[PDB]
Design a protein around this nucleic acid. Sequence first.
RNA 1: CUUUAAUGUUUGAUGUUCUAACGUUGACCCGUAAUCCGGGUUGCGGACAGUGUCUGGUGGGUAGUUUGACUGGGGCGGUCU
RNA 2: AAUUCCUUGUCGGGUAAGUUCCGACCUGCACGAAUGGCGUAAUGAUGGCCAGGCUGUCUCCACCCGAGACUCAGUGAAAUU
RNA 3: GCUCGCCGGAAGACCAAGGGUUCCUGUCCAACGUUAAUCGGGGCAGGGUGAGUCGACCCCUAAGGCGAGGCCGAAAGGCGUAGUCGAUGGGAAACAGGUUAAUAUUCCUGUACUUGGUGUUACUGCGAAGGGGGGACGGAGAAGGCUAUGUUGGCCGGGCGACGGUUGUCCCGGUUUAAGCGUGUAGGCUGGUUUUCCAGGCAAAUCCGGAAAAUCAAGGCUGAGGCGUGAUGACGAGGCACUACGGUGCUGAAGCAACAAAUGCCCUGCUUCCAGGAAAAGCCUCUAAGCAUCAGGUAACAUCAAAUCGUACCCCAAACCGACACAGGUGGUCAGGUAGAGAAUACCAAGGCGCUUGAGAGAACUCGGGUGAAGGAACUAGGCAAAAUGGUGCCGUAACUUCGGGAGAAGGCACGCUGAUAUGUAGGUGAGGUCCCUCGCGGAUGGAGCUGAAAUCAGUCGAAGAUACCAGCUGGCUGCAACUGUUUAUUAAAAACACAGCACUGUGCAAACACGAAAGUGGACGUAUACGGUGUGACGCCUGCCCGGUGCCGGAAGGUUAAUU
RNA 4: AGGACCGAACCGACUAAUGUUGAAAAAUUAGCGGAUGACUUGUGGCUGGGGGUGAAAGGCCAAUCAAACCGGGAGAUAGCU
Lengths: 271, 46
Amino acid sequence: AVVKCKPTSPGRRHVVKVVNPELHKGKPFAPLLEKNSKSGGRNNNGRITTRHIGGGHKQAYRIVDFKRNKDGIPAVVERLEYDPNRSANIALVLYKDGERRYILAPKGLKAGDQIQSGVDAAIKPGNTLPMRNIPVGSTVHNVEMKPGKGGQLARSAGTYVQIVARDGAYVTLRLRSGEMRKVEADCRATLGEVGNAEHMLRVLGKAGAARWRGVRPTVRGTAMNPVDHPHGGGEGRNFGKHPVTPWGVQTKGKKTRSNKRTDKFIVRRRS
Amino acid sequence: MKRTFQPSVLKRNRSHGFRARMATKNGRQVLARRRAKGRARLTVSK
RNA sequence: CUUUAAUGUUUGAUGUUCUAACGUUGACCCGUAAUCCGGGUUGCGGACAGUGUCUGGUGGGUAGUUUGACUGGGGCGGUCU
RNA sequence: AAUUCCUUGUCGGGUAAGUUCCGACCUGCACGAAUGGCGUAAUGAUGGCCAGGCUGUCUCCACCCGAGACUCAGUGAAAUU
RNA sequence: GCUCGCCGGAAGACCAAGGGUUCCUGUCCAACGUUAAUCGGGGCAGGGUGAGUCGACCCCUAAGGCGAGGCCGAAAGGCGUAGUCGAUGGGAAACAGGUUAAUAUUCCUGUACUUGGUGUUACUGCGAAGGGGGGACGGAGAAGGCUAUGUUGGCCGGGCGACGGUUGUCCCGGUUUAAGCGUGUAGGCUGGUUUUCCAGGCAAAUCCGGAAAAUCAAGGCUGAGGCGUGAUGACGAGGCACUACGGUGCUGAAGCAACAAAUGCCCUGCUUCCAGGAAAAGCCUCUAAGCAUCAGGUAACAUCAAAUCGUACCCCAAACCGACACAGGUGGUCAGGUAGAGAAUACCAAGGCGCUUGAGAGAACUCGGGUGAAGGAACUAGGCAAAAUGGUGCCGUAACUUCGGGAGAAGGCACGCUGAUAUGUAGGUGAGGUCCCUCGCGGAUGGAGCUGAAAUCAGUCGAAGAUACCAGCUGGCUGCAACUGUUUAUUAAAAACACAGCACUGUGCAAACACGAAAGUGGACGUAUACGGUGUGACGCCUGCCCGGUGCCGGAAGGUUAAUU
RNA sequence: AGGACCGAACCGACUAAUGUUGAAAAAUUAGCGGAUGACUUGUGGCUGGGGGUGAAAGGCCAAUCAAACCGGGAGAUAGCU
Ligand SMILES: [Mg+2]
Ligand SMILES: [Mg+2]
Ligand SMILES: [Mg+2]
Ligand SMILES: [Mg+2]
Ligand SMILES: [Mg+2]
Ligand SMILES: [Mg+2]
Ligand SMILES: [Mg+2]
Ligand SMILES: [Mg+2]
Ligand SMILES: [Mg+2]
Ligand SMILES: [Mg+2]
Ligand SMILES: [Mg+2]
Ligand SMILES: [Mg+2]
Ligand SMILES: [Mg+2]
Ligand SMILES: [Mg+2]
Ligand SMILES: [Mg+2]
Ligand SMILES: [Mg+2]
Ligand SMILES: [Mg+2]
Ligand SMILES: [Mg+2]
Ligand SMILES: [Mg+2]
Ligand SMILES: [Mg+2]
Ligand SMILES: [Mg+2]
Ligand SMILES: [Mg+2]
Ligand SMILES: [Mg+2]
Ligand SMILES: [Mg+2]
Ligand SMILES: [Mg+2]
Ligand SMILES: [Mg+2]
Ligand SMILES: [Mg+2]
Ligand SMILES: [Mg+2]
Ligand SMILES: [Mg+2]
Ligand SMILES: [Mg+2]
Ligand SMILES: [Mg+2]
Ligand SMILES: [Mg+2]
Ligand SMILES: [Mg+2]
Ligand SMILES: [Mg+2]
Ligand SMILES: [Mg+2]
Ligand SMILES: [Mg+2]
Ligand SMILES: [Mg+2]
Ligand SMILES: [Mg+2]
Ligand SMILES: [Mg+2]
Ligand SMILES: [Mg+2]
Ligand SMILES: [Mg+2]
Ligand SMILES: [Mg+2]
Ligand SMILES: [Mg+2]
Ligand SMILES: [Mg+2]
Ligand SMILES: [Mg+2]
Ligand SMILES: [Mg+2]
Ligand SMILES: [Mg+2]
Ligand SMILES: [Mg+2]
Ligand SMILES: [Mg+2]
Ligand SMILES: [Mg+2]
Ligand SMILES: [Mg+2]
Ligand SMILES: [Mg+2]
Ligand SMILES: [Mg+2]
Ligand SMILES: [Mg+2]
Ligand SMILES: [Mg+2]
Ligand SMILES: [Mg+2]
Ligand SMILES: [Mg+2]
Ligand SMILES: [Mg+2]
Ligand SMILES: [Mg+2]
Ligand SMILES: [Mg+2]
Ligand SMILES: [Mg+2]
Ligand SMILES: [Mg+2]
Ligand SMILES: [Mg+2]
Ligand SMILES: [Mg+2]
Ligand SMILES: [Mg+2]
Ligand SMILES: [Mg+2]
Ligand SMILES: [Mg+2]
Ligand SMILES: [Mg+2]
Ligand SMILES: [Mg+2]
Ligand SMILES: [Mg+2]
Ligand SMILES: [Mg+2]
Ligand SMILES: [Mg+2]
Ligand SMILES: [Mg+2]
Ligand SMILES: [Mg+2]
Ligand SMILES: [Mg+2]
Ligand SMILES: [Mg+2]
Ligand SMILES: [Mg+2]
Ligand SMILES: [Mg+2]
Ligand SMILES: [Mg+2]
Ligand SMILES: [Mg+2]
Ligand SMILES: [Mg+2]
Ligand SMILES: [Mg+2]
Ligand SMILES: [Mg+2]
Ligand SMILES: [Mg+2]
Ligand SMILES: [Mg+2]
Ligand SMILES: [Mg+2]
Ligand SMILES: [Mg+2]
Ligand SMILES: [Mg+2]
Ligand SMILES: [Mg+2]
Ligand SMILES: [Mg+2]
Ligand SMILES: [Mg+2]
Ligand SMILES: [Mg+2]
Ligand SMILES: [Mg+2]
Ligand SMILES: [Mg+2]
Ligand SMILES: [Mg+2]
Ligand SMILES: [Mg+2]
Ligand SMILES: [Mg+2]
Ligand SMILES: [Mg+2]
Ligand SMILES: [Mg+2]
Ligand SMILES: [Mg+2]
Ligand SMILES: [Mg+2]
Ligand SMILES: [Mg+2]
Ligand SMILES: [Mg+2]
Ligand SMILES: [Mg+2]
Ligand SMILES: [Mg+2]
Ligand SMILES: [Mg+2]
Ligand SMILES: [Mg+2]
Ligand SMILES: [Mg+2]
Ligand SMILES: [Mg+2]
Ligand SMILES: [Mg+2]
Ligand SMILES: [Mg+2]
Ligand SMILES: [Mg+2]
Ligand SMILES: [Mg+2]
Ligand SMILES: [Mg+2]
Ligand SMILES: [Mg+2]
Ligand SMILES: [Mg+2]
Ligand SMILES: [Mg+2]
Ligand SMILES: [Mg+2]
Ligand SMILES: [Mg+2]
Ligand SMILES: [Mg+2]
Ligand SMILES: [Mg+2]
Ligand SMILES: [Mg+2]
Ligand SMILES: [Mg+2]
Ligand SMILES: [Mg+2]
Ligand SMILES: [Mg+2]
Ligand SMILES: [Mg+2]
Ligand SMILES: [Mg+2]
Ligand SMILES: [Mg+2]
Ligand SMILES: [Mg+2]
Ligand SMILES: [Mg+2]
Ligand SMILES: [Mg+2]
Ligand SMILES: [Mg+2]
Ligand SMILES: [Mg+2]
Ligand SMILES: [Mg+2]
Ligand SMILES: [Mg+2]
Ligand SMILES: [Mg+2]
Ligand SMILES: [Mg+2]
Ligand SMILES: [Mg+2]
Ligand SMILES: [Mg+2]
Ligand SMILES: [Mg+2]
Ligand SMILES: [Mg+2]
Ligand SMILES: [Mg+2]
Ligand SMILES: [Mg+2]
Ligand SMILES: [Mg+2]
Ligand SMILES: [Mg+2]
Ligand SMILES: [Mg+2]
Ligand SMILES: [Mg+2]
Ligand SMILES: [Mg+2]
Ligand SMILES: [Mg+2]
Ligand SMILES: [Mg+2]
Ligand SMILES: [Mg+2]
Ligand SMILES: [Mg+2]
Ligand SMILES: [Mg+2]
Ligand SMILES: [Mg+2]
Ligand SMILES: [Mg+2]
Ligand SMILES: [Mg+2]
Ligand SMILES: [Mg+2]
Ligand SMILES: [Mg+2]
Ligand SMILES: [Mg+2]
Ligand SMILES: [Mg+2]
Ligand SMILES: [Mg+2]
Ligand SMILES: [Mg+2]
Ligand SMILES: [Mg+2]
Ligand SMILES: [Mg+2]
Ligand SMILES: [Mg+2]
Ligand SMILES: [Mg+2]
Ligand SMILES: [Mg+2]
Ligand SMILES: [Mg+2]
Ligand SMILES: [Mg+2]
Ligand SMILES: [Mg+2]
Ligand SMILES: [Mg+2]
Ligand SMILES: [Mg+2]
Ligand SMILES: [Mg+2]
Ligand SMILES: [Mg+2]
Ligand SMILES: [Mg+2]
Ligand SMILES: [Mg+2]
Ligand SMILES: [Mg+2]
Ligand SMILES: [Mg+2]
Ligand SMILES: [Mg+2]
Ligand SMILES: [Mg+2]
Ligand SMILES: [Mg+2]
Ligand SMILES: [Mg+2]
Ligand SMILES: [Mg+2]
Ligand SMILES: [Mg+2]
Ligand SMILES: [Mg+2]
Ligand SMILES: [Mg+2]
């Protein structure tokens, strides 16, 4: 479960870690791996475009099915696995025709279950259906936005959306952020919540435990010189300014959304 | 004390070599300028 | 002349539907041995979004500069016709 | 008080003698609650103070062992004027 | 040449990068060498680098670079697809001895191995720009089996000692051998075989994947070392004769066992943990269009080929980077004896050096050290510097605490040598012999030999037994920052930065944001338990009043207000 | 097990003395910190000057940095010596 560590060292006193004994211990399924090198937050001009990224541990990409294409051929879950590229776990499934795939593991799914895809699929967790075939009021995850494009909402650990209405050719969804959105009814979604719900209950404990995840230190603006930040300067600790980003824009309360071609699908803001 | 010049032949040619000068418009004007002066050797390619 | 209800009056705006310009970082086929690109079929959005010229506000993010003289040293105070 | 000018404030401890130290008072020139307030085990080539041991740090210096300085042969500079 | 001193985890030996004739021989001493010079890394002349197996070249790719068309941009140009380059990584094969003034895994002697072409013979279905497998991958920890290596004994050769003794339980030296070929061992992994079927592997597949029966339970893969051979060989102390005294030619004894033992091998193993640990080709297998007597594939024998370039020397430095023959810097490999936990430290082996000015004297003063009567911080801004402490085993140990700590707190006792327990103990290792045996690198019994702590009792020497080198000073009160870390290369290492944790706010994905005239790219192959910005800075108790000003978020009755007309 | 403890190689740089026309344009000597990690190191690559990178000192970008170096405008201007 979630376990404290005894304080036998200064760096272990505050460490909390989540352990799942149902995860695979061996190596992944080789035919579904790839390579991704690290960028350091640098674009094709070589400059840093996102700050505080760099270093960490080597990782391999797992090809995860976000479309759930093949319909009418049932699958069986073989094992649950670790994935360094996301906060959720993944499950290796074997279809009845001999094909193996990776999918996001939902809550309550274990080895030996059975998942299904299509139009006449059962309403049980792990199955994927068009949202016109799902009853109104159900909890779903891995939700599309454009039919045939692939799962792109409610993908983290312990997240989900709920279908609150169906009015014409669209459905209305209540997202984790709390704002209500309209999407088409022909998009697909997987029944249930996403597993690994206890992911957020861990404490890193030491400065070097965040370096293992490729995060570099953050220098506060007030500790810089006037030439570096709008906040820098002083003889002592002086601020006397409205807080801003390193590029001079208000950072506390000012709205930054501006997209007029997608506002028609927003029912109400997240508040 | 470690000084500033640490030699390496591979990185001498990849940076100031002949084929590196000919690869860009500005590099080609270096060779033109050095031929106009009358230099015995153009590049570091020795 | 005013406080008024109403047909007919030159427009100004605010909404709704349409497809044909236009957008597609949705799906399929071809060039093709190719996650680029172009062409074709279709779904979605749709005269909106987006770009050009003109124009009111904001704009130390950046740039060029100014910030007087007298003075029992300079500054503070005072003076300048 | 890393904050208190007057100030070596006043009282108690430690010293034969303590502008520094420790515990208090409150009259806070000019503390104060995430430009965080008050505590806090462990940690520190971090600032202040006190003891035991130890000593040439000192009263107050003496002798000895080596490398220069000194004489002889060879080579042979510099600032400045 | 004989003595003396110094290094010896280096001041020894070998590679890479970098340098380029500094390498060896003959000759010369003007200039160079911080002095002289017959000497030299100096001047001049000549000589010296030998590869199918070592490295490059070659095949394959990472980060990244270039980029036919293409998209974009006043021009120059930017990005990028198909491709093509790019090691620091993956891909076939040689070892011992001898020899030159100077090269050698390259030459010679002995014994080997690899990949291709061609021919003959005997069989046979071959075929890719495609499919599948493999190559192919982390940190820490523990133990077992070994070897490199060392020590002792046996054997062989020589010795009988400048001054008391030395025919013995005495002294000195040697006791070496490779690749390859055969066997398959300690260990590690995995059930085997045969039939039928199939929405998967861009088409096909007999191959991979999946499903169902039958049947047998032992098959397969991998693997250090040992043994045999290689090898009736080579090597070998020493002796024998010249010596043109620098070296030559000849013969050549023994060539074994026991114990200890790596940080090296089995081991790309096994156990465990989370931070979840490259790519492509060579290699094996399957077929598609095609060919069918053919062409191709397999095997045996024979024969041919393996081109080109580097190879001298500098070995952590007098030859590279520092203007110097410069107390500086420079990546990897090897690793003997005694003491020791040790790659620390002391003394030595092999090997290499005495650092390119010397000779005297023995003033002040300066530099680096040794000792010091009585006192013991009285010195000074300040115990700065020096002095002191220092090991192992046992006993014992306070406030406080986040229950881990504080703590090696503080403090006390023992420590050499000899004898006995015990002519060497507990333990370790284990030969002949006996029995079985699916006879063999086996199992059971057995103890010869070898190695070997610690402890107790008695005696004994010194002023001193952790005797040298090596090797904590301790305790009390308090400010700051929780801690490990980072910082002004060259006057500041700190209370400054970072940090785990907390909060506010923006962001619904073509996300916000950032680099870009643009195209594009990072964020992210992520999706609100996610990403960016800002402040505070573990943990405990908490975080109060004020919305006038300035920001930000929302509202719309009214005043004023641009282009335009 | 551990950003655990002691301590060599390896990486640093807290104190004192020497040196200061140095052996050395930042070192030597005696002590000092870390030493399984936010560690250290070899080879190659990428970021370019109002730009880069910065656990943030205006630090570093070839002994050069509150705006590198080279060439040009250029014989800039100098009520001053
Ligand atoms: Mg990554
Ligand atoms: Mg990326
Ligand atoms: Mg930038
Ligand atoms: Mg961030
Ligand atoms: Mg990675
Ligand atoms: Mg419609
Ligand atoms: Mg961090
Ligand atoms: Mg933070
Ligand atoms: Mg910060
Ligand atoms: Mg900040
Ligand atoms: Mg400030
Ligand atoms: Mg600051
Ligand atoms: Mg600052
Ligand atoms: Mg900048
Ligand atoms: Mg500013
Ligand atoms: Mg400041
Ligand atoms: Mg202040
Ligand atoms: Mg601003
Ligand atoms: Mg938006
Ligand atoms: Mg330098
Ligand atoms: Mg060069
Ligand atoms: Mg509409
Ligand atoms: Mg329509
Ligand atoms: Mg269109
Ligand atoms: Mg379309
Ligand atoms: Mg269309
Ligand atoms: Mg198209
Ligand atoms: Mg439509
Ligand atoms: Mg649109
Ligand atoms: Mg518009
Ligand atoms: Mg400004
Ligand atoms: Mg402005
Ligand atoms: Mg401002
Ligand atoms: Mg300005
Ligand atoms: Mg001007
Ligand atoms: Mg004036
Ligand atoms: Mg005067
Ligand atoms: Mg008193
Ligand atoms: Mg004092
Ligand atoms: Mg008080
Ligand atoms: Mg304050
Ligand atoms: Mg206040
Ligand atoms: Mg405040
Ligand atoms: Mg604070
Ligand atoms: Mg707090
Ligand atoms: Mg406090
Ligand atoms: Mg505090
Ligand atoms: Mg303390
Ligand atoms: Mg303290
Ligand atoms: Mg202190
Ligand atoms: Mg001080
Ligand atoms: Mg004292
Ligand atoms: Mg004196
Ligand atoms: Mg003397
Ligand atoms: Mg003397
Ligand atoms: Mg003299
Ligand atoms: Mg004289
Ligand atoms: Mg003289
Ligand atoms: Mg002169
Ligand atoms: Mg020594
Ligand atoms: Mg040593
Ligand atoms: Mg050496
Ligand atoms: Mg070399
Ligand atoms: Mg070379
Ligand atoms: Mg020469
Ligand atoms: Mg020579
Ligand atoms: Mg000579
Ligand atoms: Mg002469
Ligand atoms: Mg001379
Ligand atoms: Mg001679
Ligand atoms: Mg010579
Ligand atoms: Mg020659
Ligand atoms: Mg060869
Ligand atoms: Mg050759
Ligand atoms: Mg060759
Ligand atoms: Mg080879
Ligand atoms: Mg590429
Ligand atoms: Mg082109
Ligand atoms: Mg362009
Ligand atoms: Mg390009
Ligand atoms: Mg290539
Ligand atoms: Mg290589
Ligand atoms: Mg390689
Ligand atoms: Mg590898
Ligand atoms: Mg290789
Ligand atoms: Mg040689
Ligand atoms: Mg040779
Ligand atoms: Mg040789
Ligand atoms: Mg060879
Ligand atoms: Mg043949
Ligand atoms: Mg393949
Ligand atoms: Mg493993
Ligand atoms: Mg490992
Ligand atoms: Mg052995
Ligand atoms: Mg041997
Ligand atoms: Mg041996
Ligand atoms: Mg030994
Ligand atoms: Mg032996
Ligand atoms: Mg022995
Ligand atoms: Mg004998
Ligand atoms: Mg005899
Ligand atoms: Mg004698
Ligand atoms: Mg005698
Ligand atoms: Mg071999
Ligand atoms: Mg076995
Ligand atoms: Mg199969
Ligand atoms: Mg023995
Ligand atoms: Mg060679
Ligand atoms: Mg050689
Ligand atoms: Mg060398
Ligand atoms: Mg060395
Ligand atoms: Mg050295
Ligand atoms: Mg010289
Ligand atoms: Mg010399
Ligand atoms: Mg030297
Ligand atoms: Mg050694
Ligand atoms: Mg040794
Ligand atoms: Mg030894
Ligand atoms: Mg020992
Ligand atoms: Mg010892
Ligand atoms: Mg020993
Ligand atoms: Mg010695
Ligand atoms: Mg010797
Ligand atoms: Mg003297
Ligand atoms: Mg005394
Ligand atoms: Mg005394
Ligand atoms: Mg005393
Ligand atoms: Mg005093
Ligand atoms: Mg005094
Ligand atoms: Mg001291
Ligand atoms: Mg001392
Ligand atoms: Mg002394
Ligand atoms: Mg106490
Ligand atoms: Mg103790
Ligand atoms: Mg204490
Ligand atoms: Mg005794
Ligand atoms: Mg005894
Ligand atoms: Mg025994
Ligand atoms: Mg005893
Ligand atoms: Mg006794
Ligand atoms: Mg006695
Ligand atoms: Mg010791
Ligand atoms: Mg010790
Ligand atoms: Mg006490
Ligand atoms: Mg207090
Ligand atoms: Mg204080
Ligand atoms: Mg600190
Ligand atoms: Mg620290
Ligand atoms: Mg530093
Ligand atoms: Mg400094
Ligand atoms: Mg420090
Ligand atoms: Mg700092
Ligand atoms: Mg955090
Ligand atoms: Mg732009
Ligand atoms: Mg542009
Ligand atoms: Mg992206
Ligand atoms: Mg991406
Ligand atoms: Mg702060
Ligand atoms: Mg806190
Ligand atoms: Mg508050
Ligand atoms: Mg307000
Ligand atoms: Mg208000
Ligand atoms: Mg109010
Ligand atoms: Mg309020
Ligand atoms: Mg408003
Ligand atoms: Mg540690
Ligand atoms: Mg340590
Ligand atoms: Mg080094
Ligand atoms: Mg310092
Ligand atoms: Mg000192
Ligand atoms: Mg030192
Ligand atoms: Mg140390
Ligand atoms: Mg420590
Ligand atoms: Mg490099
Ligand atoms: Mg590098
Ligand atoms: Mg660049
Ligand atoms: Mg620029
Ligand atoms: Mg800067
Ligand atoms: Mg510099
Ligand atoms: Mg500039
Ligand atoms: Mg400027
Ligand atoms: Mg800058
Ligand atoms: Mg330069
Ligand atoms: Mg210029
Ligand atoms: Mg002009
Ligand atoms: Mg001039």
